[PDB]
Each structure stands twice: as structure tokens, then as C-alpha cells.
Design a protein around this motif. Sequence first.
Motif, PDB file in Angstrom:
ATOM      1  N   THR A 178       0.820  -1.214   0.000  1.00 57.13           N
ATOM      2  CA  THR A 178       0.000   0.000   0.000  1.00 57.13           C
ATOM      3  C   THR A 178       0.857   1.269   0.000  1.00 57.13           C
ATOM      4  OG1 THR A 178      -0.402   0.330   2.415  1.00 57.13           O
ATOM      5  CG2 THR A 178      -1.809  -1.292   1.263  1.00 57.13           C
ATOM      6  N   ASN A 179       2.034   1.204   0.623  1.00 57.17           N
ATOM      7  CA  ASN A 179       2.970   2.335   0.657  1.00 57.17           C
ATOM      8  C   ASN A 179       4.014   2.368  -0.484  1.00 57.17           C
ATOM      9  OD1 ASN A 179       4.751   0.278   1.539  1.00 57.17           O
ATOM     10  ND2 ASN A 179       5.775   1.651   2.988  1.00 57.17           N
ATOM     11  N   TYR A 180       3.875   1.501  -1.496  1.00 57.72           N
ATOM     12  CA  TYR A 180       4.881   1.364  -2.573  1.00 57.72           C
ATOM     13  C   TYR A 180       5.276   2.696  -3.200  1.00 57.72           C
ATOM     14  CZ  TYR A 180       6.455   0.879  -7.451  1.00 57.72           C
ATOM     15  OH  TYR A 180       7.095   1.039  -8.655  1.00 57.72           O
ATOM     16  N   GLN A 181       4.283   3.427  -3.698  1.00 61.64           N
ATOM     17  CA  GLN A 181       4.525   4.717  -4.350  1.00 61.64           C
ATOM     18  C   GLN A 181       4.982   5.816  -3.389  1.00 61.64           C
ATOM     19  OE1 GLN A 181       2.514   5.311  -8.576  1.00 61.64           O
ATOM     20  NE2 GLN A 181       1.024   5.705  -6.930  1.00 61.64           N
TER      21      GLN A 181
ATOM     22  N   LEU B  81      -4.157   3.150  -6.671  1.00 60.95           N
ATOM     23  CA  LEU B  81      -5.052   2.643  -7.733  1.00 60.95           C
ATOM     24  C   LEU B  81      -5.888   3.736  -8.446  1.00 60.95           C
ATOM     25  CD1 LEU B  81      -6.426  -0.635  -6.098  1.00 60.95           C
ATOM     26  CD2 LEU B  81      -4.620  -0.461  -7.818  1.00 60.95           C
ATOM     27  N   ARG B  82      -5.715   4.998  -8.040  1.00 57.27           N
ATOM     28  CA  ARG B  82      -6.437   6.157  -8.594  1.00 57.27           C
ATOM     29  C   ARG B  82      -7.946   6.088  -8.301  1.00 57.27           C
ATOM     30  NH1 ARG B  82      -1.696   5.252 -10.507  1.00 57.27           N
ATOM     31  NH2 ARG B  82      -0.797   7.285  -9.915  1.00 57.27           N
ATOM     32  N   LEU B  83      -8.296   5.485  -7.163  1.00 59.83           N
ATOM     33  CA  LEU B  83      -9.685   5.319  -6.739  1.00 59.83           C
ATOM     34  C   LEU B  83     -10.054   6.100  -5.459  1.00 59.83           C
ATOM     35  CD1 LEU B  83     -10.197   1.496  -7.438  1.00 59.83           C
ATOM     36  CD2 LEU B  83     -10.444   3.409  -9.023  1.00 59.83           C
ATOM     37  N   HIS B  84      -9.083   6.796  -4.862  1.00 58.81           N
ATOM     38  CA  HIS B  84      -9.295   7.631  -3.660  1.00 58.81           C
ATOM     39  C   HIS B  84     -10.285   8.799  -3.775  1.00 58.81           C
ATOM     40  CE1 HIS B  84      -6.401  10.180  -5.704  1.00 58.81           C
ATOM     41  NE2 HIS B  84      -6.407  11.070  -4.730  1.00 58.81           N
ATOM     42  N   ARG B  85     -10.650   9.182  -4.998  1.00 57.52           N
ATOM     43  CA  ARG B  85     -11.748  10.140  -5.241  1.00 57.52           C
ATOM     44  C   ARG B  85     -12.835   9.525  -6.152  1.00 57.52           C
ATOM     45  NH1 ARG B  85     -10.813  15.498  -4.373  1.00 57.52           N
ATOM     46  NH2 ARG B  85     -11.465  16.132  -6.481  1.00 57.52           N
ATOM     47  N   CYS B  86     -12.899   8.191  -6.155  1.00 60.41           N
ATOM     48  CA  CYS B  86     -13.918   7.390  -6.841  1.00 60.41           C
ATOM     49  C   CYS B  86     -14.804   6.644  -5.837  1.00 60.41           C
ATOM     50  CB  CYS B  86     -13.248   6.364  -7.763  1.00 60.41           C
ATOM     51  SG  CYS B  86     -14.360   5.212  -8.614  1.00 60.41           S
ATOM     52  N   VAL B  87     -14.183   6.010  -4.838  1.00 61.76           N
ATOM     53  CA  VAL B  87     -14.866   5.121  -3.895  1.00 61.76           C
ATOM     54  C   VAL B  87     -15.500   5.896  -2.732  1.00 61.76           C
ATOM     55  CG1 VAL B  87     -14.560   3.176  -2.269  1.00 61.76           C
ATOM     56  CG2 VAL B  87     -13.266   3.215  -4.417  1.00 61.76           C
ATOM     57  N   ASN B  88     -16.712   5.487  -2.356  1.00 61.70           N
ATOM     58  CA  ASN B  88     -17.338   5.943  -1.114  1.00 61.70           C
ATOM     59  C   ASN B  88     -16.893   5.040   0.032  1.00 61.70           C
ATOM     60  OD1 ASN B  88     -19.220   8.169  -1.940  1.00 61.70           O
ATOM     61  ND2 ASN B  88     -20.061   6.523  -3.226  1.00 61.70           N
TER      62      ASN B  88
ATOM     63  N   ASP C 294      -4.111   4.881   1.114  1.00 57.29           N
ATOM     64  CA  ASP C 294      -2.898   4.886   0.284  1.00 57.29           C
ATOM     65  C   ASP C 294      -3.015   3.897  -0.874  1.00 57.29           C
ATOM     66  OD1 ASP C 294      -1.914   6.748   2.082  1.00 57.29           O
ATOM     67  OD2 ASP C 294      -0.307   5.491   2.847  1.00 57.29           O
ATOM     68  N   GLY C 295      -3.597   2.733  -0.602  1.00 54.98           N
ATOM     69  CA  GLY C 295      -3.851   1.723  -1.622  1.00 54.98           C
ATOM     70  C   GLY C 295      -4.821   2.191  -2.686  1.00 54.98           C
ATOM     71  N   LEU C 296      -5.946   2.764  -2.245  1.00 56.35           N
ATOM     72  CA  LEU C 296      -6.909   3.394  -3.149  1.00 56.35           C
ATOM     73  C   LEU C 296      -6.253   4.526  -3.940  1.00 56.35           C
ATOM     74  CD1 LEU C 296     -10.097   3.664  -0.892  1.00 56.35           C
ATOM     75  CD2 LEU C 296      -9.812   2.115  -2.830  1.00 56.35           C
ATOM     76  N   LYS C 297      -5.496   5.378  -3.246  1.00 48.76           N
ATOM     77  CA  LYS C 297      -4.792   6.494  -3.888  1.00 48.76           C
ATOM     78  C   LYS C 297      -3.872   6.037  -5.010  1.00 48.76           C
ATOM     79  CE  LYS C 297      -2.121  10.695  -3.134  1.00 48.76           C
ATOM     80  NZ  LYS C 297      -1.131  11.373  -2.257  1.00 48.76           N
TER      81      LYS C 297
ATOM     82  N   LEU D 207      -8.198  -4.294  -2.497  1.00 48.34           N
ATOM     83  CA  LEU D 207      -7.517  -3.485  -3.514  1.00 48.34           C
ATOM     84  C   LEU D 207      -7.237  -4.277  -4.800  1.00 48.34           C
ATOM     85  CD1 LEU D 207      -5.042  -1.692  -1.112  1.00 48.34           C
ATOM     86  CD2 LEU D 207      -7.012  -0.617  -2.238  1.00 48.34           C
ATOM     87  N   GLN D 208      -6.880  -5.553  -4.650  1.00 44.91           N
ATOM     88  CA  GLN D 208      -6.698  -6.462  -5.796  1.00 44.91           C
ATOM     89  C   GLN D 208      -8.019  -6.743  -6.523  1.00 44.91           C
ATOM     90  OE1 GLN D 208      -2.636  -8.731  -4.155  1.00 44.91           O
ATOM     91  NE2 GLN D 208      -4.634  -9.735  -3.926  1.00 44.91           N
ATOM     92  N   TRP D 209      -9.098  -6.936  -5.767  1.00 43.75           N
ATOM     93  CA  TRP D 209     -10.435  -7.059  -6.358  1.00 43.75           C
ATOM     94  C   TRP D 209     -10.847  -5.810  -7.140  1.00 43.75           C
ATOM     95  CZ3 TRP D 209     -13.018  -9.172  -1.275  1.00 43.75           C
ATOM     96  CH2 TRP D 209     -12.811 -10.558  -1.196  1.00 43.75           C
ATOM     97  N   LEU D 210     -10.499  -4.628  -6.626  1.00 43.11           N
ATOM     98  CA  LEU D 210     -10.773  -3.359  -7.319  1.00 43.11           C
ATOM     99  C   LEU D 210     -10.023  -3.220  -8.649  1.00 43.11           C
ATOM    100  CD1 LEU D 210     -11.009  -0.936  -4.252  1.00 43.11           C
ATOM    101  CD2 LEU D 210     -12.796  -1.253  -5.969  1.00 43.11           C
ATOM    102  N   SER D 211      -8.848  -3.844  -8.756  1.00 36.31           N
ATOM    103  CA  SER D 211      -8.088  -3.899 -10.013  1.00 36.31           C
ATOM    104  C   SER D 211      -8.672  -4.841 -11.073  1.00 36.31           C
ATOM    105  CB  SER D 211      -6.635  -4.332  -9.756  1.00 36.31           C
ATOM    106  OG  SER D 211      -5.987  -3.480  -8.829  1.00 36.31           O
TER     107      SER D 211
END
Length: 775
Positions: free
Chosen positions: A76-79, A290-297, A285-288, A234-238
Motif C-alpha cells: 500500500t505504501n509502494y509509491q 489505484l487512482r480510486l481515492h476520489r472514486c470510492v465511497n 494509500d492503496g486506493l490512492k 484493492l486487488q479485487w478493485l483492479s
Amino acid sequence: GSCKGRCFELQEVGPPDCRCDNLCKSYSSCCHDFDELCLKTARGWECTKDRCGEVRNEENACHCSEDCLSRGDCCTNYQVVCKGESHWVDDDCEEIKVPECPAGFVRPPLIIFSVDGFRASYMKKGSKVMPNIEKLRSCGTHAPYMRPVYPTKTFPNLYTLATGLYPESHGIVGNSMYDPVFDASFHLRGREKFNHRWWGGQPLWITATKQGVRAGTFFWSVSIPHERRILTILQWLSLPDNERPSVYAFYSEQPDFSGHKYGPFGPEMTNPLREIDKTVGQLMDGLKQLRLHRCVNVIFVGDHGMEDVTCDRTEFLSNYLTNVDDITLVPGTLGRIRAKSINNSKYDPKTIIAALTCKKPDQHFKPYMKQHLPKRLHYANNRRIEDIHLLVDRRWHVARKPLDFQGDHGFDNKVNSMQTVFVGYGPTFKYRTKVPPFENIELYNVMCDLLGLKPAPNNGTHGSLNHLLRTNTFRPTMPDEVSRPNYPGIMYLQSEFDLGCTCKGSTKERHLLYGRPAVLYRTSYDILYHTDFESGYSEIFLMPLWTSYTISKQAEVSSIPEHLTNCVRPDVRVSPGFSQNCLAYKNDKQMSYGFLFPPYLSSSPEAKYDAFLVTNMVPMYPAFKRVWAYFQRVLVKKYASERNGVNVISGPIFDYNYDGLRDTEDEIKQYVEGSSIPVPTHYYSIITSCLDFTQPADKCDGPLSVSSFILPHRPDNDESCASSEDESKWVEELMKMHTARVRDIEHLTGLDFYRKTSRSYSEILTLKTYLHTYE
Ligand SMILES: *[C@@H]1O[C@H](CO)[C@@H](O[C@@H]2O[C@H](CO)[C@@H](O[C@@H]3O[C@H](CO[C@H]4O[C@H](CO[C@H]5O[C@H](CO)[C@@H](O)[C@H](O)[C@@H]5O)[C@@H](O)[C@H](O[C@H]5O[C@H](CO)[C@@H](O)[C@H](O)[C@@H]5O[C@H]5O[C@H](CO)[C@@H](O)[C@H](O)[C@@H]5O)[C@@H]4O)[C@@H](O)[C@H](O[C@H]4O[C@H](CO)[C@@H](O)[C@H](O)[C@@H]4O)[C@@H]3O)[C@H](O)[C@H]2NC(C)=O)[C@H](O)[C@H]1NC(C)=O
Ligand SMILES: Cc1c(Sc2cccc(C(=O)O)c2)c2ccc(Cl)cc2n1-c1ccccc1
Ligand SMILES: [Ca+2]
Ligand code: NA
Ligand SMILES: [Zn+2]
Ligand SMILES: [Zn+2]
């Protein structure tokens, strides 16, 4: 045989195929290489600067290689450490005006982050202890607290979140329970709970799936640690569009366990909460990345709070009963008593209730037949709820005997220590918005709205939390009235009645401030105008369904003059055939009467005579009249004085089968001796005022303010242990204990209130769900 490329697969697989899903360890059915392939722990859950740009090694738990982002299985902290990104928490709060999702996404996803034993006051520790959660709370939509359901235990509340139902309806009436039809018991520990026969209603995951919305498997074996769960979501979201789920859940067992051992206010709660916040940080951080941190509720929600409860503060039933091995007790922060052995004729519920009522002076539990529990608890209409119930005081336990933790919970859901949390963060939620407290029974509807789903029939008031949302897919609509009122004039002379009794524009605009209550069932009733009050008189039940009046801040109180103490006058507008008679009340030894509009508050001596009409009269026990007379004479004036006048709608309730719903004619089981006058099980009152208290009740421009109660219509006052003393010492605390929402009374009466106001309908639904707790 194997789990390669198969780990945490979303589909179930039947026998004879071995499983690789997130719950296979609890069903002892994983493939031999599940632990090997799917539960890798090598090199932790965080990238380090050394590992950046590594070659892919499949033994690692999570990855820091160049290809990790392509595969969607980085740490989750990779980037953060390798690309110089910021943690989500470190960034500024930025308004999410629309969902920013990748192409393919047909809807913003929903992740429910569920925390166990999370007391609402823990949020006051803030970003010092919980940075991520304090960001979620402050940036999204939040409440000061959220009311759980009773009992304030895990499984009833968790499954109430999933279904929008009360425990009595959804069937999970406690963590532990016995079913007399199955002849079997349910516990937190054991295999029985997995049997689907215990679980009623329609939880969110089934509602989603049945309407074609894919749901990510909600449940995780306790062997599977928290970091793995976050990584799998997070893997399911991908996953590709056609496969991936739109709704997810993470359950955390903390800080319940820490709360039990060290208490709610112990120094040892800080690391538990940091562990929770850390886990939330890994999600964001994981959502961020994956570019989903302003997509997911994200919903950050609790199931209940936690109270200081020590083993020294325990009540023992062996001090009260001389038969404790003839009963089985469900112990702790509540009591449920049952016959120990079935086929025991000597067991008697009445003698048990007698022996438990008001014995010690400082007694820390109160016994109840479940039908007499306060109606706001809705804890009675299920065969798994034992008839005998003990409401235990906050900070106390009830056990069976002395030969049978610093914190506990399970107490009355109004209790402040039992209040839990709610945050909603994401596009569909509002931005930097505080909202008033609400009941967890409402959220199922909201979660259905977030996913664009039609909710299953439930106990939320749909529309009551539209004020939480930036965009609403549900606009609430007023129910159509079924029964048109009659407005009968004078058509029966005073000599035409033989009852054994001896003795309009100005009305509406002062006494029906918020319009006429609509009757949502098929019946025949009459509107009756008077100077001091208006009522909807039922011809079937021989009494008002509702009686509405208004009392200003400077309105006088008067006595019942002595020559009118037994006065009951026949109503010339209403037929003898559809009227009560005083002969029944004489012949009924235990039954007396009272009046819905009070004669104690009539505007003049002449106007007082309408209060003594037979069409204002209702059956009341002498015991109940002490409660009712104090309310009317003292308290209704007191509320008008404090709140700058009050509108009061009072009336009867009939609920003999204790289902929280209006009884039909055949369901009524007690009448006034030798008559058709039905006896109410309760009496309600809806006391409304202006929220802006400087403006009077009948001159309110802005929003409204409401109190209500559903007083039980009891032959005695054994419930009140100080009932020998003056009514100033006991009846007001009795009323507060049986406080209610306007919604509860609408279920119980089949009426609809507040139909003509200046407020929007969603705002009125919020008013109808409000509960005054006095905490
Ligand atoms: C809170 O909200 C709930 C839900 O809105 C309210 O409860 C509901 O109250 C209704 C009126 O009493 C009940 O209707 C009656 O149902 C009888 C049996 O039918 C069942 O079907 C139900 C609905 O099925 C749909 O929805 C479910 C998801 O919920 C889906 O799975 C399906 O696909 C359907 O789309 C179902 O909920 C019922 O389940 C109950 O029984 C099982 C055991 O088999 C339990 O596991 C459940 O927990 C649940 O038990 C609760 O409810 C029953 C009463 O149903 C109580 O006895 C229990 O103690 C427990 O509390 C059923 O499988 C009908 O036969 C019955 O018909 C009579 O009346 C009609 C006219 O109205 C006449 O025509 C007939 O002559 C007949 O006598 C009636 O329709 C709902 O079942 C009930 N639903 C739930 C979920 O509890 C509740 O009032 C709300 N509370 C307040 C305070 O307002
Ligand atoms: C079976 C079940 C269970 S039991 C369970 C769940 C997760 C982990 C474990 C474990 O032992 O590790 C146990 C359950 C619990 C809560 C809810 Cl809301 C629901 C729960 N359901 C449920 C019932 C009906 C339909 C779907 C799920
Ligand atoms: Ca009923
Ligand atoms: Na009498
Ligand atoms: Zn819990
Ligand atoms: Zn607990």
C-alpha cells in the motif's frame, strides 16, 4: 487440487473441488497449497527504500517491483517510498464534486469499514491518535454519534446495519440465543451460526447480487490478518469491469477486545486505535495508488460503544429467587430468563417477576415481561426473545449466582456509553458536513442509495438521511390517505342517549398547527371541532384516534371543579350506537376513565364542558390515571412554559401482539367488562414546538422541535419503585424511559403526521425519526 491464480476467488466452488475463497479456513475446506500460495507473509506489509525497483519474487506478501502496479498487487505504501508520493493523510482536504473513476466504472464503489466496540467519544482524541480517521471525519460527512440497536451487542447491530431491520425482525436477537422451534442454540463461537435458518431479512450483499450488482465476499476467517484483507480488496478493485465487485466490507474486531480488558478510558486504548488508523491508512494509500481515492465511497461505521463494567458490580438472582437451578439465564449487561428444563410444570413467570421487582433499595436491574419493555427498543416480536427480560443499569452486570474484564456493553441503546460512530467519505457524500445523530437502522437505505439499489422492506425511514448525500437517487413521497373523514353535524338529541352517564376555522388554525393526520388504513371516523381541541373520533374503536390541542406560554391551568368530577356528557354529533357508556365503567371494577384533551387546561369554565364529552373519554386504570393526571395538570404546562407553547397530539395505541404495528379489530384481547370498548395497551403524545424557541409554536417560520412518548397502560406502577411517593418524584422519569419517535407512533397507529408545514418532506422525515433521550 490447487489455488494457483485462484487465491481469494470471488465465486464459491461446490464439492468435490477444494476452495480458495476468503472463508475456506472457517469451513476447513481450502486446498493444501492455500496457505502456501495465498497467505504469504515474506518481508512484511510495507515497501522499504531498499526494495524499490526489485525483480519480482513470488514469495513476497506484497510487491515493490516495476510490474506491481500493472498487476495491482503492490504494498500500500509502494509509491510513497519508491515514487516519492505522499500518504493520503498528508494531503490537503479536496472536495470531490463528482466521482473521479477510470473508464469502465459504471458506479462509484462502496467500502464499509466496520469497527467493533468503537465508542463515539474516542473521536475526541482526534488526529493526535487517529490521523486518517480524523481526515475522513472532517472532510466527509459525519455525526456526533450514531445510535445502535438493543441489545447493544455485536451480531444484532452488525446484522442491523446489513438489513436495516430491528433484531426482532431480522432474528439475531443476541450474540447468544435459543430457538424453541429448531430446539437449538446460537453462539458467537461454534458451527450453528453458519446455518442460514437463523438469518432473516435481506442483507446488503444479497440485495446487491439479486439486482445484478456484484458484491465482494464480506467475510474473512480470523486466521487471515488485516493487511491481507486490505490488499485483497484493492486487488479485487483492479479486476476487469465484468468481474469486479462494486461493494466491499472490512470488519475489525478492535477496539472491542481492548475496551473489555482495560475499560473505555484506559491508557491502553491508544495503540488499538493507532492500529485501526494504520489499517485505514493502508486502505486510503492503496486506493490512492489505484487512482480510486476520489472514486470510492468509504463508510467508517461502528456497531456500539463501551462502558466501565467491573465484576464487583454484579447482581445475583440467587439473592432474589429461591429456585435458580429451575431457570436458565442469559447473563451480563442484560438478562433473559427461561425455564431450564422443558417439561417442568412448577415454573411460573408471574412469581419470578414478583420476586425480582423493587426488593433492594439500590437495585441495579429491572424485570419486564417483554411486551412491557419500552416500545423504542422494539425488542419483543420474536420467539427467540424470552418473555422475562432484565434491563440492567449502565455500569452493571446480572448473573444467576455468585459462582458464575473492566469494560462491557449490551445496555439500553439510549445510553451515552453505547453510542458509536459514523463517517461517510467520497463523491456521493457531502463535504465538511456535520449531521445530527441518527439510528443505525437507517443506513441500509443509504447504502442502497449509494449503490443505486432498491432497498428491501426495512425499518429505516427512506428519505430521512437525504441530508447526508450530495446527490439523492430517492425522493420521498407522502403516503396517500385511505380513509376520508366525516364531518358530522348535530343529528341526535340529548334525550336519545342512554349511557348511564350523569352531569371551525379558529379551531384548525390554532389546534392543528401541522395539518390533519392522515389515516393510512380503511376505517370510518369523524372529525370533531371544539374551542380548546380537535379530534378524529373512531366509530369502530369508540374513541379518538388522535386529539390535537395547543397551549401557549402564558396559558392558565385550572382544577376539575368538584361538581364535574364524575361528569360525562353525550356527544350530540356522534350516534349512541357508536358511543361509549358509563355503565360499563361502573360494572368494570378495575377500569376507570380519563380524558385525552385535559379538563385541567380548558380556556374557560364554559369551554371546560367539551372536555367532559363522551367522545373525549378513554379507558384508564386507577394506577395509570396518576401518571396521566400529572402529565396533563403539571407537565403539559411546564413544557409550554419552557418551549414557548406546545402543540400536543395525544391518543390511544392497541398492540396486544407486541409487533410495534397497529392492531386490527380481531387482535384486540381486552375490553371494558361487558362492552365493545377496547382497552389500549399504551397512550401516546406528540409534543411539537418551534426550534427557534423565541418564536411561539403557532408562529414558527423556521424548523420544528419535537418530543414524544408511548406510555404503557399498566394496571399497577410496579415498574416505578418510588410509586408510593408523590408523582413529582417518579412519573416524569417513567415518561423519559418510554420516550419515542413520531415514527414509532405512526407504526402503532397507522396515522401520518406533519402533512401541512413549510418544511421540505425529507426534513420532516428527519423530524419523525428524532428521539429525545435526556442524556
Ligand atoms: C420492520 O420492517 C419489517 C419489514 O418491512 C416489518 O416486518 C414485516 O412485517 C410484515 C407484517 O407482519 C410481515 O408480513 C407477513 O409475512 C408473513 C410471512 O412472509 C414472509 O416473507 C417476508 C418477506 O419476504 C420478502 O423479503 C425477504 C427479505 O426480507 C426476501 O427474502 C424475500 O425474497 C421476499 O422478497 C419475510 O421477511 C418473512 O421472514 C420472517 O420469518 C422468517 C422465518 O421463516 C424469519 O427468519 C425472518 O426473520 C422473519 O421473521 C420475522 O417476521 C415474522 C413475521 O413475518 C415474525 O413472526 C417473526 O417473529 C420475526 O419478527 C417471511 O418469510 C405473511 O404470511 C403474512 O401474511 C399475513 O398478512 C397478509 C396481509 O398483510 C394476509 O394476506 C394473510 O392472511 C397473512 O395472515 C405477512 O405478509 C413480514 O414478514 C415482516 N418482514 C420482516 C423481514 O420481518 C416490521 O413490521 C417493521 N417494524 C416496524 C416496527 O414497523
Ligand atoms: C454465516 C455468517 C456469519 S458467521 C462468520 C462471519 C465471518 C467470520 C466468521 C468466522 O468464524 O471467522 C464467522 C455472519 C456474521 C455476521 C454477519 Cl452480518 C453475517 C454472517 N453470516 C451470514 C449469514 C447468512 C448469509 C450470509 C452470511
Ligand atoms: Ca400489533
Ligand atoms: Na370502576
Ligand atoms: Zn461488537
Ligand atoms: Zn464486545
